[PDB]
Amino acid sequence: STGSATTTPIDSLDDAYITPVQIGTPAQTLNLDFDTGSSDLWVFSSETTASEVDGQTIYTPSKSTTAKLLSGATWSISYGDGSSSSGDVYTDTVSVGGLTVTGQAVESAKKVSSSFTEDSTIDGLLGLAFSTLNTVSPTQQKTFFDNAKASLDSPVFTADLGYHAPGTYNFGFIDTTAYTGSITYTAVSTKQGFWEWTSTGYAVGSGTFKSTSIDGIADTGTTLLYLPATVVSAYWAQVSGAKSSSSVGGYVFPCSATLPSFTFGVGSARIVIPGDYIDFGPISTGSSSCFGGIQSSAGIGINIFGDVALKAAFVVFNGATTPTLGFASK
């Protein structure tokens, strides 16, 4: 089997991407944030505290003839941005772009933190990291991809995120029309539960490539590119007036600037992030200070190849017995 679903930016900045997902019988379609950095499929629901729902579409398990309470199971997750959610668990039928999994754990939120409530466009998350990170207790549950894998034509999914435009998540096949050149594959460590790999270096604009190993994660659920302070300083030093602002929380730059591109290495191959992809717009409405799309990871503990990086490539998440990642230009 295969599936194919369009993923759409939630706003004019590409802050995140939503993909329609069918849950239950009859189908209830929710728009979920596919997140290769986490491993829980959770949704706003009829159980979510009413004051914490503000425009999201909810899953109502009592209206699904295929929903079953997973007795005793609870979940609770906290994300790198400080947001969080928690609740109980049902199993139900879940379909993405025509690919159906029966018995998928659907984690129903009883509580969500303010940032989730405040984002009316995201009805929940669909985790695509390794199932070892799933938070369901006392019996850990499998991701949608893990459950679908054996049925797929090939044990892979691909992320093709758009810049200010829709893109595609495919399951079970590699669309050879969706990228240019060849796909370069690179080793993955699953030891932390992430799609963790080592970039071979970087360049800023038309500058020379610096060969250096940068370990980080391919994370569709993180907006920006978080890299070591040395790399980020080298990037922003090429932008007149850019500075790191403690009050704003990262590098800012004059909105009048034209940003240089940023290149990262995948083996001997190179992915070029155009400068425009690094502009996240005014720090507050009407400001002429703009927020940078490349930021330091120094306070995180891990480098994160988020959407800024991934949307410059066609990315293969290869879930073969030994997982690997593939990157192509597009």
Residue 253: CB partners within 8 Å, gap ≥ 6? 236, 239, 241, 242, 243, 259, 289, 290, 292
Q: What is the CATH number of the domain that holds 129?
A: 2.40.70.10
Q: Which ranges of 127-272 would DSSP assign to H, the alpha helix?
A: 144-148, 229-236
* φ, ψ of residue 151 in degrees (nearest 5): -85, -15
Length of the chain: 330
What is the stated resolution of the deposited model, in angstroms? 1.1
Whole-number Å distance between alpha carbons of 232 and 235: 5
Whole-number Å distance between alpha carbons of 113 and 125: 14
Both 209 and 219 in one domain: the answer is yes
Whole-number Å distance between alpha carbons of 87 and 85: 7
Whole-number Å distance between alpha carbons of 272 and 256: 22
Please give the sequence-ordered ranges of beta strands (E in DSSP) within 10-98, or none if there are none.
17-23, 28-35, 41-43, 68-78, 84-96
Determine whether 173 is exposed, middle or buried from the number of CB atoms within 10 Å of its CB (0-12, 13-18, 19+): middle
Amino acid at 315: V
Block residue for tokens 């199993």 = 91
Catalytic residue (choose from 39, 45, 85, 199): 199
DSSP state of 51: G
Number of H helices, E strands in the chain: 4, 24
Both 185 and 327 in one domain: the answer is yes
Whether 79 and 222 have beta carbons less than 8 Å apart is answered as no
Domain that holds residue 143: 5-174
Residue 19: CB partners within 8 Å, gap ≥ 6? 5, 6, 7, 8, 31, 32, 33, 34, 96, 97, 126, 169
Q: Distance between the two ends of the chain, CA-based, in angstroms?
A: 25
CA dihedral for 175, 6, 272, 233, sign (positive or negative): negative
Determine whether 216 is exposed, middle or buried from the number of CB atoms within 10 Å of its CB (0-12, 13-18, 19+): buried
Catalytic residue (choose from 33, 35, 123, 307): 35
Q: Say whether the peptide bond before residue 26 is cis (omega within 30 degrees of 0).
A: yes
Whether 122 and 31 have beta carbons less than 8 Å apart is answered as yes
Whether 61 and 90 have beta carbons less than 8 Å apart is answered as yes
Both 230 and 329 in one domain: the answer is yes
User: Where does a domain end: 140, 159, 174?
Assistant: 174
> Of 30, 20, 50, 187, whose CA–CA distance to 110 is shortest?
50
Q: Which ranges of the chain would DSSP assign to H, the alpha helix?
A: 114-117, 144-148, 229-236, 307-310
Residue 247 among the catalytic residues: no
Both 189 and 165 in one domain: the answer is no
Residue 246: CB partners within 8 Å, gap ≥ 6? none
The structural domain count of the chain equals 2
Residue 199 among the catalytic residues: yes
Region for 157 from its dihedrals, namely left if φ exceeds 0, alpha if ψ lies in -120 to 50, beta otherwise: beta
